[PDB]
Amino acid sequence: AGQIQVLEGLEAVRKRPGMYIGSTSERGLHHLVWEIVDNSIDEALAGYANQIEVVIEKDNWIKVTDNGRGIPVDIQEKMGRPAVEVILTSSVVNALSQDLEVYVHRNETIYHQAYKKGVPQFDLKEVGTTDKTGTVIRFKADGEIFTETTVYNYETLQQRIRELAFLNKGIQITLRDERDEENVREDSYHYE
Ligand SMILES: CCCC(=O)Nc1sccc1C(N)=O
Ligand SMILES: [Cl-]
Ligand SMILES: [Mg+2]
């Protein structure tokens, strides 16, 4: 029933990414991180998260982790599908990613799903157990969309992360660049 409105949202985002993110250039690539990080910052504003970690991984995957509630997994009556899957299939970031993965820690369970260009590659599954709550999102910007550059710039991430931790007092926000195994760089911000 409601599966059809989700697929027009993806085509739209992907024909006119600019309308959603400003550009398909370097600046838009970095907007993808800001979208995901803002969700984690809302977990902390809600009172649940206090730590957010942003990692630039090998082959320019971005990994964002928070220790908030974990995205819900309960079945939605209208879609018939887990809440996380609904949430992530209307995500601009996901649409503009050749690959995206989620891990949710919730209900003493670790759940996993992956997507390409916004489309679920398999059903939500329980892959492990946990005594923490939170959410991990890893995504790789789509080279068929980001046809100029899919390489992140550390100082641009660093700059904004620091401003965000300064604005949002009490949240520990860490940035790490792991792309060169031989020289890993980390900056961790925590105000008050
Ligand atoms: C109780 C609702 C929690 C939720 O939707 N959280 C979301 S939606 C997308 C990201 C995240 C996150 N990082 O917690
Ligand atoms: Cl749940
Ligand atoms: Mg948003």
Swiss-Prot record:
GO biological process: DNA topological change; DNA-templated DNA replication; response to antibiotic
Gene Ontology molecular function terms on file: ATP binding; DNA binding; DNA negative supercoiling activity; metal ion binding
Keywords: Antibiotic resistance, ATP-binding, Cytoplasm, DNA-binding, Isomerase, Magnesium, Metal-binding, Nucleotide-binding, Topoisomerase
Keyword Repeat (UniProt): no
Subcellular locations according to the entry: Cytoplasm
The UniProt record lists the keyword Transcription regulation: no
Disulfide linkage: none
Coiled coil: none
Assigned GO CC terms: chromosome; cytoplasm
Misc remark: Few gyrases are as efficient as E.coli at forming negative supercoils. Not all organisms have 2 type II topoisomerases; in organisms with a single type II topoisomerase this enzyme also has to decatenate newly replicated chromosomes.
Subunit annotation: Heterotetramer, composed of two GyrA and two GyrB chains. In the heterotetramer, GyrA contains the active site tyrosine that forms a transient covalent intermediate with DNA, while GyrB binds cofactors and catalyzes ATP hydrolysis.
Function description: A type II topoisomerase that negatively supercoils closed circular double-stranded (ds) DNA in an ATP-dependent manner to modulate DNA topology and maintain chromosomes in an underwound state. Negative supercoiling favors strand separation, and DNA replication, transcription, recombination and repair, all of which involve strand separation. Also able to catalyze the interconversion of other topological isomers of dsDNA rings, including catenanes and knotted rings. Type II topoisomerases break and join 2 DNA strands simultaneously in an ATP-dependent manner.
Sequence similarity: Belongs to the type II topoisomerase GyrB family.
Protein name: DNA gyrase subunit B
Origin species: Staphylococcus aureus
Organismal lineage: Bacteria, Bacillati, Bacillota, Bacilli, Bacillales
Gene that this polypeptide is encoded by: gyrB
Interval of the full protein contained in this chain: 16 to 230 of 644
